[PDB]
Amino acid sequence: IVGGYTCGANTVPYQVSLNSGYHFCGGSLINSQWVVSAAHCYKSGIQVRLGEDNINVVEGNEQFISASKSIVHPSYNSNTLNNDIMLIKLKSAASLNSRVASISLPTSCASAGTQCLISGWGNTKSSGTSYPDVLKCLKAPILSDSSCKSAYPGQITSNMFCAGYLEGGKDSCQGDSGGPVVCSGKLQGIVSWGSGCAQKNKPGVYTKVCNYVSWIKQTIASN
Ligand SMILES: [Ca+2]
Ligand SMILES: [Mg+2]
Fold first, then answer.
1. What are phi and psi of 178, to 5 degrees?
2. What are the cysteine partners in each disulfide bond?
3. What share of the chain is helix, strand, coil (3-state, %, to 5)?
4. Positive or negative, the Cα torsion across 186, 192, 196, 199?
5. Domains 1-12+103-210 and 13-102+211-223 share a fold
């Protein structure tokens, strides 16, 4: 996350770190047995880490649970990143508490202008590499599809939205992939892609979760 701030330990209790020997993607806990992340984060051998703040120091509120199964969206296209969403079931149920909580799925899509919260352990420089060990946060508004489509002609589908600042300066970056974009108490997006980080007229692009609620509910209940 570039230009954001330190969230504070466990202030984003639904935030997950996917680890395959190191942190490689974020995710969101939607209930004790399931996590939603990005399909481009798919890997075999994932351990889900809950209640994290510093990812290199066991501070006491973590739960590390292995994944039993992963389900990438049936229509994920890794070339365009359309339908960039995946579900991860935990081998054991998490123990929800103040530090480990789930986030709600949306009932309707959010409007442009709505302020959201983006969080992750990704790169914090736009031009450089500095990976933080504690969770960083960024409040950013959803942009109009018009400004999103002008920035990326022929690349945005109805399953994507942009959030950020066209002036640049604040944005998600690598290491944030798969993490949450929460607006008004609901999980509305997933960090998917963008052009570099915090560049001018290049906002980050997010998976539009409100379009996958029936698929998520149907899939988790049948698995
Ligand atoms: Ca830790
Ligand atoms: Mg993240």
1. 80, -15
2. 7-137, 25-41, 109-210, 116-183, 148-162, 173-197
3. 10, 35, 55
4. negative
5. yes
Is 57 annotated as belonging to a binding site?
yes
Distance from residue 52's CA to the centre of ligand 1 (Å): 5
- Cβ(173)–Cβ(198) below 8 Å: yes
- What's the CA-to-centroid distance between 145 and ligand 2, angstroms? 23
- Architecture of the 1-12+103-210 domain: Beta Barrel (2.40)
Q: How are beta strands 15-19 and 23-31 bridged, if at all?
A: antiparallel
Q: Give the resolution to one decimal, in Å.
A: 1.5
First-to-last C-alpha distance (Å) of the chain: 33
Q: Measure 31 CA to ligand 1 centroid, in angstroms.
A: 21
- Torsion, Cα of 51, 61, 94, 71 (10° steps): 30
Cα(169)–Cα(181) distance, rounded to whole angstroms?
18
Q: Which one of the ligands is nearest to 175 CA?
A: 2
Whose CA is closest to 223, among 68, 38, 49, 40? 68
Active site residues: 40, 84, 177
Residue indicated by tokens 């979760």 = 209
Q: Per CATH, the architecture of 13-102+211-223 is what?
A: Beta Barrel (2.40)
Residue 133 C-beta-side C-alpha neighbours within 13 Å: 6
Give the residue from 36, 81, 31 showing the smallest Cα distance to 195.
Answer: 81
Boundaries of every domain in the chain? 1-12+103-210, 13-102+211-223
